């Protein structure tokens, strides 16, 4: 049920860093060691810049909804739009350029171990320190369901 209109586009480069370039077109700041992940909750879409990804472990995009879980198609403009993350591990860019994560696929966000993470289309924007990582095919079973995804590792 995903649509491109369900992408929160609420970016505010108030620190004047130019971080938004890789959303269209070096180091991972405020590094979060994968171990002991924080729990996923409800994220206000007004704080989100660009696509939200979760990792089941396979990568899946999460779109804006209202606070009762109904898909919304306003590019995150409505200040009641949210991402209901609890409904495994997820990551997104917040409006001022900070990469945020919750949960795990211990792991954190897309990271499996401190040296490997799930590949997805916005990996290098969310984690620029992984530009030179190598990619490996992975297969994993979670409760009988088969996952096939690429992993990027150092």
């Amino acid at each position, epitope marked *: 049920s995903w649509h491109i209109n369900r992408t929160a586009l609420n970016c505010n480069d108030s620190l004047q860093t130019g971080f938004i370039t890789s959303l*269209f077109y070096s180091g991972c700041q405020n590094w979060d060691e994968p171990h002991y992940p924080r729990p996923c909750d409800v994220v206000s879409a007004r704080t989100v810049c660009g696509p939200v990804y979760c990792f089941t472990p396979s990568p899946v995009v999460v779109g804006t909804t209202d606070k009762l879980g109904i898909p919304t198609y306003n590019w995150g403009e409505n200040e009641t739009d949210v991402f209901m993350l609890e409904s495994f591990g997820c990551t997104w860019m917040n409006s001022t350029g900070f990469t945020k994560t919750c949960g795990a696929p211990g792991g954190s966000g897309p990271w499996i171990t401190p040296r490997c993470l799930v590949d997805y289309p916005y990996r290098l924007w969310h984690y620029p320190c992984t530009v030179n990582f190598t990619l490996h095919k992975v297969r994993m079973f979670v409760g009988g369901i088969e996952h096939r995804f690429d992993a990027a590792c150092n």
Partner: antibody
Framework: LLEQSGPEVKKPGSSVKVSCKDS??????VTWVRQAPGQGLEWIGG????????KYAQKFQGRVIISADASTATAYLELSSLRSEDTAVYYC?????????????????????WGQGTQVTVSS | EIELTQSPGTLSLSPGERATLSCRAS???????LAWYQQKPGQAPRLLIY???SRATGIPDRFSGSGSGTDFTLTISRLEPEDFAVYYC?????????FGQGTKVEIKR
């Protein structure tokens, strides 16, 4: 550099499509403004080509369409239902990325670079 | 809609003189979101100042901007011949982004 299409001449009630080609920042936000003869500048609308989200000023809503073509790195402005009041120079310009503000896909910042402008004349 | 009022309409000054242009906003604008542009006949506008007081890339030292709230000023400390043109202010903090009506800086003789 942004290269805009050449001048256009149109009868009332027709449509016109002007283009804005850049030569490596295509998916960066593009904003259209117009300048009526002897007037200042007026926001028409814009697009973020990476996602396709468009925004329009109320005075052009339902009467214009902005689009972008990723293969040719070109953005487009289509105005429909033309009247003589639409005679103007139409400018394309890039929204600056550093310090940009986006709300619901509406991108605003200083504007640079600029296209050279496209003259559209609407007349019987 | 935020209206931008520029004064004077026309400024007549000799080359080498200091020029002061004003732009009055109908409502308060954050200084982060005000820019100045230069336009010469038949040409596209050219960004000069952004964020009220930051000079765009390639813009000479003699252009400076200042102001806050509802009153912003563009200053050209010493007019060169290539500086005589039309100048527009722009607010891009609140949609719709709006432009002032322009000040023409004219050669006094």
């Amino acid at each position: 550099l942004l290269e805009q299409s050449g001048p256009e001449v149109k009868k009332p009630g027709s449509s016109v499509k002007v283009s804005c080609k850049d030569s490596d920042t295509f998916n960066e936000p593009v904003t259209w403004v117009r300048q009526a003869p002897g007037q200042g500048l007026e926001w028409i609308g814009g697009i973020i080509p990476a996602f396709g989200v468009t925004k329009y000023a109320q005075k052009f809503q339902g009467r214009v369409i902005i689009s972008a073509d990723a293969s040719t790195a070109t953005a487009y402005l289509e105005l429909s239902s033309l009247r003589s009041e639409d005679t103007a120079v139409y400018y394309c310009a890039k929204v600056g990325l550093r310090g940009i503000v986006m709300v619901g896909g509406l991108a605003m910042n200083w504007l640079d670079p600029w296209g050279q402008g496209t003259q559209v004349t609407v007349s019987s | 809609e935020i209206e931008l009022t520029q004064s004077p309409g026309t400024l007549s000054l000799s080359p080498g003189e200091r020029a002061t242009l004003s732009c009055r906003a109908s409502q308060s604008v954050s200084s982060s979101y005000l820019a100045w542009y230069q336009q010469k006949p038949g040409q596209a506008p050219r960004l000069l100042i952004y964020g009220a007081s930051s000079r765009a890339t390639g813009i000479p030292d003699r252009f400076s901007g200042s102001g806050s709230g509802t009153d912003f000023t563009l200053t050209i400390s010493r007019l060169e011949p290539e500086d005589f043109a039309v100048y527009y202010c722009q607010q891009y903090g609140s949609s719709p982004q709006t432009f002032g009506q322009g000040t023409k800086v004219e050669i006094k003789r």
